[PDB]
Design a protein around this ligand. Structure first.
Ligand code: NA
Ligand code: NA
Ligand code: NA
Length: 75
C-alpha cells in the first residue's frame, strides 16, 4: 500500500495550514485539518489500512471543500 501512503503524504502537504491563509478557514476547519494530519500520520506509522483509507477519504474531502469554500462573512 505504498500508493496510499504517497497519496496521504500529498494530501497532508496540500492542506498545510501555513499556506492556506488566503482561504479564510475558521477554527473548526483548521482543527479538522490538524486532526486529519495527526490521524493520517499515525495510521501510516502503524500501517493501519482501515485508518489510512479513512484518513485519505477525509483529507480528500477537506481539500475539495476548502478549495471550493464557503464565503467568509460574519453573519
Ligand atoms: Na485564516
Ligand atoms: Na472542535
Ligand atoms: Na476491516
Amino acid at each position: 500500500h505504498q500508493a496510499l501512503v504517497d497519496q496521504l503524504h500529498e494530501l497532508i502537504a496540500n492542506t498545510d495550514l501555513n499556506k492556506l491563509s488566503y482561504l479564510n478557514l475558521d477554527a473548526f476547519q483548521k482543527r479538522d485539518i490538524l486532526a486529519a494530519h495527526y490521524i493520517a500520520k499515525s495510521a501510516i506509522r502503524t500501517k493501519n489500512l482501515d485508518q489510512m483509507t479513512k484518513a485519505k477519504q477525509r483529507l480528500e474531502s477537506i481539500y475539495n471543500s476548502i478549495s471550493n469554500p464557503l464565503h467568509s462573512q460574519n453573519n
